[PDB]
Homo-oligomer: A and B are copies of this chain.
Amino acid sequence: HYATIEVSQQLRQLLGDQLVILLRETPDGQALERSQNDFRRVLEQGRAEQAALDGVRDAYLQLQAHTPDNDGFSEAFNGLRLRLQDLQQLALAGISEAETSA
């Protein structure tokens, strides 16, 4: 499980990274590209559940194909998702902490 949560969180973060970029006034195409590469990078890696990761790849391929204050919204979204992400990782730590404690 613990492997499948890490690779899951990475992809979700990289997806969020890409939304932050898309939600900006002037989308940094190079960055988006770099981020799209990291995603398929981290994914392909994890791809070696194997169906769900295959399903992710299939779904990512489709997002890619459809990919096109406004900068204020982008930054607030980024702010919010990092905190939610960190909230989960905090709680998740408190558990691996507990598992060990036993």
- Chain A residues numbered 1-41 whose CB sits less than 8 Å from any CB in chain B: 1-2, 4-5, 7-9, 11-12, 15, 19
Assess whether A62 is interfacial by the CB under 8 Å rule.
yes
Q: Given A4-B91, A73-B63, A92-B5, decide whether A84 and B15 contact each other with a Cβ distance below 8 A.
A: yes
Please give the count of copies of this chain that the complex contains. 2
20 chain-A/chain-B pairs, Cβ below 8 angstroms: A1-B94, A4-B88, A5-B88, A8-B91, A12-B12, A15-B77, A15-B84, A19-B19, A49-B90, A49-B91, A52-B86, A52-B87, A55-B83, A56-B83, A56-B87, A59-B83, A63-B76, A63-B77, A66-B70, A66-B76
Chain A interface residue count, Cβ-Cβ cutoff 8 angstroms = 46
